[PDB]
Design a protein around this ligand. Structure first.
Ligand SMILES: [Cl-]
Ligand SMILES: [Cl-]
Ligand code: NA
Ligand SMILES: [Xe]
Ligand SMILES: [Xe]
Ligand SMILES: [Xe]
Length: 129
């Protein structure tokens, strides 16, 4: 499923991401934009063999199981395919664990390089939330 900008903002807010760990909603929407362009079915193969899944491109190296990432972990205790669902519950719950890991949203390199420090509020402007 490809979410609309404001549609995703609303879904993320309902799931408790707005200001989670101190990160305003705009930060999450901005991260999703550059990680997946709002597409829940987005996937990407990393150089080390791991794969990124979903709207927040969560990696199989530590967070989910895809059965093809040697020596990896599944800290979110979920099959990576769950991160591709039209229902973002799994992605949100796992994202909450990731952002609480110690480095905040810097865990998402795209957020650090393209969202961090910018006017992320623009990503939710005009949205009825
Ligand atoms: Cl594996
Ligand atoms: Cl932080
Ligand atoms: Na894994
Ligand atoms: Xe992929
Ligand atoms: Xe998400
Ligand atoms: Xe909403």
């Amino acid at each position: 499923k490809v979410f609309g900008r404001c549609e995703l903002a609303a879904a993320m807010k309902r799931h408790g991401l707005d200001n989670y760990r101190g990160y305003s909603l705009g930060n999450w929407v901005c991260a999703a934009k550059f990680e997946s362009n709002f597409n829940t079915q987005a996937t990407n193969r990393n150089t080390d063999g791991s794969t990124d899944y979903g709207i927040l491109q969560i990696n199989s190296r530590w967070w989910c199981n895809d059965g093809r990432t040697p020596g990896s972990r599944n800290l979110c205790n979920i099959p990576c395919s769950a991160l591709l669902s039209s229902d973002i519950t799994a992605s949100v719950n796992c994202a909450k664990k990731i952002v609480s890991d110690g480095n905040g949203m810097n865990a998402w390199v795209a957020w650090r390089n393209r969202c961090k420090g910018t006017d992320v509020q623009a990503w939710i402007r005009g949205c009825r939330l």
